[PDB]
Amino acid sequence: FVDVTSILIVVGGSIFVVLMKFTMGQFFGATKIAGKAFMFKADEPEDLIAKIVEMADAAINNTFMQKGIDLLVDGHDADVVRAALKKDIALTDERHTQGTGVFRAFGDVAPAMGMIGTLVGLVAMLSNMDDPKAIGPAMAVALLTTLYGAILSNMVFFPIADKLSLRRDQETLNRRLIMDGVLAIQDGQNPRVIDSYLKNYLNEGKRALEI
């Protein structure tokens, strides 16, 4: 069925408990990063490897690669650029981990609020008992709370957290690949050896099955 009241109780309880766990700004940041992870697509590492091939042959669309190029242009040794790239990678990983934490908290909180709403509805129905033919359908809407929680605990929040973790894995893999390409560029290595080195990353811990 559909019920505005039941979904309202579930969402309100989940929001209150999460906003006690986190802050409003962190919640909005997690929502924005989840939306960016869903509506956008991470760049394929093959395309990044080919871009690094072109850069090495000659001697720029991703923000991280643009930052690496800018840091290489102004005569910077490997240590400072490496430290900056580690800082950026750690910042991105921390942001994704915190978003995963927010959505996991929502997932763990939603079914408890569903049960609370179900119990409240049952208590109300018992409190005003008038028509026996309505003892059955009335509790039905009460169960609509629990079901809602279950759905929000298994169709929305937990899958969003899993998608955020997967997107974190892709982003950190792409950033490590860009790190390796920048190090090869500043070292002035041959294109073929670094090409083999980068294609060695195409068999990471999640994409060995498409082979």
Binding site: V123, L126, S127, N128, M129, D130
Partner: peptide, 12 residues
């Protein structure tokens, strides 16, 4: 009687 007892128990 069940409804009356339920009403009395829940303080309503």
């Amino acid at each position: 009687q069940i409804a009356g007892s339920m009403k009395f128990a829940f303080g309503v």
